[PDB]
Design an enzyme around this catalytic site. Sequence first.
Site, PDB file in Angstrom:
ATOM      1  N   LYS B 154       0.805  -1.424  -0.028  1.00 16.72           N
ATOM      2  CA  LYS B 154      -0.033   0.008  -0.059  1.00 16.72           C
ATOM      3  C   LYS B 154       0.845   1.408  -0.151  1.00 16.72           C
ATOM      4  CE  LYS B 154      -2.149  -1.289   3.854  1.00 16.72           C
ATOM      5  NZ  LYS B 154      -1.561  -2.713   3.795  1.00 16.72           N
ATOM      6  N   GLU B 180       0.570   5.727  10.975  1.00 16.49           N
ATOM      7  CA  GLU B 180       1.377   4.956  10.299  1.00 16.49           C
ATOM      8  C   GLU B 180       2.686   5.153  10.988  1.00 16.49           C
ATOM      9  OE1 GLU B 180       1.090   2.458   8.401  1.00 16.49           O
ATOM     10  OE2 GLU B 180      -0.997   2.514   8.797  1.00 16.49           O
ATOM     11  N   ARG B 181       3.859   4.895  10.331  1.00 14.36           N
ATOM     12  CA  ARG B 181       5.166   4.562  10.924  1.00 14.36           C
ATOM     13  C   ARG B 181       6.018   6.001  10.708  1.00 14.36           C
ATOM     14  NH1 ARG B 181       4.382   0.031   7.698  1.00 14.36           N
ATOM     15  NH2 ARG B 181       3.935  -1.852   9.168  1.00 14.36           N
TER      16      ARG B 181
HETATM   17  N1  LIG Z   1       6.467  -2.394  -6.149  1.00 10.61           N
HETATM   18  C1  LIG Z   1       7.192  -3.352  -5.487  1.00 10.61           C
HETATM   19  N2  LIG Z   1       8.086  -4.140  -5.878  1.00 10.61           N
HETATM   20  C2  LIG Z   1       8.818  -5.180  -5.147  1.00 10.61           C
HETATM   21  N3  LIG Z   1       8.435  -5.346  -3.790  1.00 10.61           N
HETATM   22  C3  LIG Z   1       7.270  -4.669  -3.395  1.00 10.61           C
HETATM   23  C4  LIG Z   1       6.654  -3.763  -4.195  1.00 10.61           C
HETATM   24  N4  LIG Z   1       5.507  -3.053  -3.383  1.00 10.61           N
HETATM   25  C5  LIG Z   1       5.750  -4.088  -1.959  1.00 10.61           C
HETATM   26  N5  LIG Z   1       6.642  -4.693  -2.214  1.00 10.61           N
HETATM   27  C6  LIG Z   1       7.116  -5.664  -0.907  1.00 10.61           C
HETATM   28  O1  LIG Z   1       6.209  -5.668  -0.014  1.00 10.61           O
HETATM   29  C7  LIG Z   1       6.742  -5.023   1.230  1.00 10.61           C
HETATM   30  C8  LIG Z   1       5.728  -4.210   1.792  1.00 10.61           C
HETATM   31  O2  LIG Z   1       5.262  -3.035   1.393  1.00 10.61           O
HETATM   32  P1  LIG Z   1       4.531  -1.785   2.104  1.00 10.61           P
HETATM   33  O3  LIG Z   1       4.130  -0.778   1.196  1.00 10.61           O
HETATM   34  O4  LIG Z   1       4.930  -1.419   3.469  1.00 10.61           O
HETATM   35  O5  LIG Z   1       3.184  -2.717   2.250  1.00 10.61           O
HETATM   36  P2  LIG Z   1       1.609  -2.263   3.203  1.00 10.61           P
HETATM   37  O6  LIG Z   1       2.028  -0.806   3.032  1.00 10.61           O
HETATM   38  O7  LIG Z   1       0.638  -2.887   2.442  1.00 10.61           O
HETATM   39  O8  LIG Z   1       2.229  -2.836   4.415  1.00 10.61           O
HETATM   40  C9  LIG Z   1       7.902  -4.445   0.774  1.00 10.61           C
HETATM   41  O9  LIG Z   1       9.122  -4.260   1.922  1.00 10.61           O
HETATM   42  C10 LIG Z   1       8.525  -4.993  -0.258  1.00 10.61           C
HETATM   43  O10 LIG Z   1       9.490  -5.997   0.270  1.00 10.61           O
HETATM   44 MG   LIG Z   2       2.266   0.895   4.567  1.00  4.91          MG
END
Ligand SMILES: Nc1ncnc2c1ncn2[C@@H]1O[C@H](COP(=O)(O)OP(=O)(O)O)[C@@H](O)[C@H]1O
Ligand SMILES: [Mg+2]
EC number: 7.1.2.2
Lengths: 485, 467, 466
Positions: B154, B180-181
């Site tokens: 996200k 969030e963080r």
């Molecule tokens: N476009 C992308 N390409 C490669 N890996 C991704 C991508 N989007 C997410 N990820 C993987 O998923 C993990 C979590 O992403 P994050 O945006 O923090 O998820 P959320 O916000 O849904 O918790 C990242 O650390 C990465 O390893």
């Molecule tokens: Mg997030």
Amino acid sequence: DLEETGRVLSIGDGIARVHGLRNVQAEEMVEFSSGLKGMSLNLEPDNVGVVVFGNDKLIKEGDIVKRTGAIVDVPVGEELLGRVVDALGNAIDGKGPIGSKARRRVGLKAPGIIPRISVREPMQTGIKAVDSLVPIGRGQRELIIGDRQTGKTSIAIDTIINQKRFNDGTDEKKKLYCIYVAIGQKRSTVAQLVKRLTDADAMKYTIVVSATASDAAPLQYLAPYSGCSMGEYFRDNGKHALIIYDDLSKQAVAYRQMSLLLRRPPGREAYPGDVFYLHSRLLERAAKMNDAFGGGSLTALPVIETQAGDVSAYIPTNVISITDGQIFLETELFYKGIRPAINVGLSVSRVGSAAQTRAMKQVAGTMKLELAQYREVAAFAGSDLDAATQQLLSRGVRLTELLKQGQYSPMAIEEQVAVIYAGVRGYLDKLEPSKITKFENAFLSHVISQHQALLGKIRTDGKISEESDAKLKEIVTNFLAGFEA
Amino acid sequence: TTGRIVAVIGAVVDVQFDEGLPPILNALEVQGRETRLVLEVAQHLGESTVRTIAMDGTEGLVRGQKVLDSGAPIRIPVGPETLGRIMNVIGEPIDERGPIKTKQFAAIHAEAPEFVEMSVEQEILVTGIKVVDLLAPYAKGGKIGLFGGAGVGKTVLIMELINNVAKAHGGYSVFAGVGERTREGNDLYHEMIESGVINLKDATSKVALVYGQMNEPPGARARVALTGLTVAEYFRDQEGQDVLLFIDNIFRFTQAGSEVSALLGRIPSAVGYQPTLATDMGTMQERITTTKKGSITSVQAIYVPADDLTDPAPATTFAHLDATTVLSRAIAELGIYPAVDPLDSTSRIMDPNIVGSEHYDVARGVQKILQDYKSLQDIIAILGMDELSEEDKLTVSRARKIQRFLSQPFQVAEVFTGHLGKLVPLKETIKGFQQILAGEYDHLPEQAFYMVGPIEEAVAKADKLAE
Amino acid sequence: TTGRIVAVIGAVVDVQFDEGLPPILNALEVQGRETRLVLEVAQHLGESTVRTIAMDGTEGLVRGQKVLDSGAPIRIPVGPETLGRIMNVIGEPIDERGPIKTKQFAAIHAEAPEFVEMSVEQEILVTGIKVVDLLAPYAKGGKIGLFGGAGVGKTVLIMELINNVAKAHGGYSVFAGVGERTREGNDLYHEMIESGVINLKDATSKVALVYGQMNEPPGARARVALTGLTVAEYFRDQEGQDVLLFIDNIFRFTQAGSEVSALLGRIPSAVGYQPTLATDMGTMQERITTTKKGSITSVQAIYVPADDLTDPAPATTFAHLDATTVLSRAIAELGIYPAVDPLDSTSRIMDPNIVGSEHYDVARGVQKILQDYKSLQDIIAILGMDELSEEDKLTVSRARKIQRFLSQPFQVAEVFTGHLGKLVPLKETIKGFQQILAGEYDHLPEQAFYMVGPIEEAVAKADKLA
Ligand SMILES: Nc1ncnc2c1ncn2[C@@H]1O[C@H](COP(=O)(O)OP(=O)(O)O)[C@@H](O)[C@H]1O
Ligand SMILES: [Mg+2]
Ligand SMILES: Nc1ncnc2c1ncn2[C@@H]1O[C@H](COP(=O)(O)OP(=O)(O)O)[C@@H](O)[C@H]1O
Ligand SMILES: Nc1ncnc2c1ncn2[C@@H]1O[C@H](COP(=O)(O)OP(=O)(O)O)[C@@H](O)[C@H]1O
Ligand SMILES: [Mg+2]
Ligand SMILES: [Mg+2]
């Protein structure tokens, strides 16, 4: 004098309803007649709800309650290293008084946006499956989640033991000071845990903060925050510290009891409305500071225990959304021989390769997708598969065997890269899967005793050199054919 | 008017006023504090007593402490002087750069724009991301929401939307950090300084920041989303110009509300949420809209608790959106990024009379073969690949190639995928999938479509796999 | 000095005092009762009124009836002259053998031994049972737990463990009947008189019995665990001699706590349980431990509500244990006894550094093949064993033989089976499973491994079927 002192109206289940104390602050520490401490959490128009830090047989109706005029604080500094303390920071190892020259508030809020910088330093655990596929960085929050007896504590313990290599060295920003927070465990387990760290010579840089099962709920509730403030000292003084909350499941249980008996209405699974904020405000305090603030860090390793793998439960779902990643452990894999029982598919680390040494990035970079291609074909296979898809199954099975690792033998990063190298480059593709574990033991000990100059060059250079790549290839191919016969 | 605290229970503070009682939603200033503490009036309990929610920690509060009524709701700095600055819930700078110099302020609580002020104008905007552009396109001034459980992407998705869309925009952007963080706050701040969207010396800054992360108490998290959108409401109305608003994460708005609901004296609703869940979101989201005065393009990251889309928080959020991007864990587990579910994402502007009959038919064609592949996946799970007809394995190979071609490297995800990110035009996106559906690349290998830009890169990668 | 009853409901009784209020945990004596009725003070309600919990039936109580403070908490007889005797919650003899004239008395409430008092000694206790010794062996001075649902064999297991260990343990033993069957207490008492471990004629008695069964009100069941615990505590400290503590069943402690919690005006926790569940269990369980002063090898039977191991009562208990023995209904219904789940029974001493590299590897080998067999279970039920590969068919046959060789005839179950009780040494248990894993008995039929002692009897059973 009802402004500075009060009188107990009722006392039961660790909760004292006190009349008076008109100038008492919210979350202020108060003292009882018998000397017992209490925290004022409810400020009602006609009473003050005080949670008790101990037995309540020593508190009666009519007892006098006094103000101290302060919030809770704990001792702080390098004098705590090697010591076992309780939730308030009182020594319980019987080795004397903590000669600490500083105190710190337990409820201090996390650093804001400004004082932080990107996580850029590797927090090596020594566990192949972690350092390669779920890499942790200094200042990160990494959850250890799984059912009972999956190996959760053991991940944290091996991580602590691994730091000896850094702490015995001369390089100071390479060092890491450990803090193990035990919450709701039994005293014999804790002592057996300390015995394990003493034998490994790991205690001399480890602080043990223990609020066990016989301790009052407020003691269990406060223990994580106490140990955090102890870690924050290192963080704010240009040093790097690692904290382990084992576990936040039992802390939530203790806080629920308090909240319920303070007559605060229950929610999901009887938990109070602020149970998420309980853990969020705690884990936010883990950070990597910028150079103007010292360049120190605090890495957090919270532990969560699930029930029958139910990752949907109220408590676990909170901590997953908080942390920068999770390490999932399962009993099915544990008894299948996959020890550590890390579910690679479910486990992630948001910091990623930015928390790895240049050497480990070269070998683990391909592993992620290569194992993802494997798990796709795993639940896809005896109807006979073609040469291409049978190859993907073979590679994945052999890499999985390399991710296996025993206990109390945390591996250096150069030794890790070498064994991953052999698998990831296909040098084990046509080897019988049962002898991969046997291969790794004999192969590594040969490289340890006869090829120190290779490992030493990978360690110091921080990457796989073109000459090192050639030498690694030279050893693995000739060792292969000898082992195969 | 001066009042006194009578009760403190967590974030909930009860205040007594002997004379003029302050109306609901007013901001109250607690006296004798080092940092400014705001209590927002939520209820009139009766007997000259009000119930409030704290905008910061309630530690150190005493029964009988002076509390002053400001006379109006929480008021924040608005205008071009918020650009390059980070604000909190109550409008204090937290970037250490000094006071927000302005004689123009606005209340964070306001009436939602009326029905007569609504605009039916729908125009497709290119995003550069293939899956979104092809299957579920976003509209100019539309309401976009990015759904997903924990760790599906996200934040990474919304980060690259600011990296791509703000470039194709001459106006201003607002980013609300909601529950969030704090770490990611530092990440976004320094990335934008590097990209030049925030400039610390001149006035060329084009992004205004509002932050209230998960270290803040519930009250702060409940209202920091309204602080973000009030800054967006000024750039839209008082200027008449196009604005971009990004929120990560809008679930935290609902979470924070449930965190105090018990202590406000409410009976809990279904799945442990507050009874007010729908109307709280209503009076909030209905302010996030394009009007006839100006246009807001809104992107909201939406957490899906234990990736359950039936959960009241995310399930009530669908009705507020024009374009939905739903992320999947099973698709993330395969290694497809972005992890967008092609069979669970809608757009509304998905109509032959809007995006074109050529665009529409490719989108449905891609969806049809992937849905048919799903039923074929049920066979090859038990009987295997050898059982499929020659017609069947033709559609499987095409569907698997389409899965990978939907994925692309992001320009904010250099550490995760290895190679740099790239932007793909819409006309090249329609053509690319069109070619695969016709069977023009049945000769090319499967991994040639994985993590590439346009269809031309897939052809070049096919040569690179041989030698 | 004197109190008055103002409220009565179930086990919860409220008393008002004019002058001098009794501290929490104090024993109160109700006047006008033909038999002794002890109220234990739990809460100070305010306005000089205390909330108490009885230790016997509260029927026949009137508002205005007089209550006297004893001055102390509930005090019971402790010492060598409790051996061979049966007592209730308040330490009153229930064997009709007269007064228990002890030189020492002790309160049933005591604080748990401090962190400095803890011992780190881990030494294997050979039970003679195959499933236990091989996979999850018990430790000397360690804490043992026996999990299981309704009728899977918790009681039958604890009784076999008494027979296997207590004879070879030259010391004193304590049994605490908590909320269980009264006729089981009758069977245990007279059996012990029959064998000679309890003597009515002599002071050679080695076992002390404490009973508060499922016929008692919640007050009695909630505290009876502490009464038997306090007897065990004395023998540990003020002698140095090693103690065995057997409890059946410890769940009844927490269950009875749930019954009173509903009447104490508490807001219920999850599953309707008491909010103080974990801390009530905590202050109770931490008293059952080995110190530097003396050693307690505790075995506790632990009931599992509706077979749900995620229930707050059994789930919280896991952390208070050093070795777990989980019983399964499905394994019981297959005819396997003891119905031990090989993949849910654990021990802290299951470690190559402690039990040996050969012991550990065989244990993990047995577990690997059983988890491999459990994975195929679905395809075996749909298609059949005949549709499996040659690799899978070989593991299935071996795993099915390992399953049956895990079962064992018990000496306590000499009537339930009609067979002879078997006690198998550790070395022979390791050897047995090791041979099946390496493929030495692949030709032998399955039923040959069912309900046997050592590996030699599996061969001798196969000869008769030839
Ligand atoms: N476009 C992308 N390409 C490669 N890996 C991704 C991508 N989007 C997410 N990820 C993987 O998923 C993990 C979590 O992403 P994050 O945006 O923090 O998820 P959320 O916000 O849904 O918790 C990242 O650390 C990465 O390893
Ligand atoms: Mg997030
Ligand atoms: N890598 C490993 N190899 C072999 N045994 C292990 C490994 N990790 C853990 N164990 C064993 O598993 C058991 C449970 O580990 P523990 O960390 O206590 O689980 P948890 O903390 O999840 O309850 C311990 O007895 C330990 O010896
Ligand atoms: N080891 C065993 N051998 C033979 N039968 C057993 C064994 N364990 C349990 N059973 C059978 O199960 C019944 C119930 O056992 P019990 O220990 O009373 O269960 P629980 O105490 O768990 O309710 C017994 O009557 C017996 O027939
Ligand atoms: Mg553990
Ligand atoms: Mg029984």
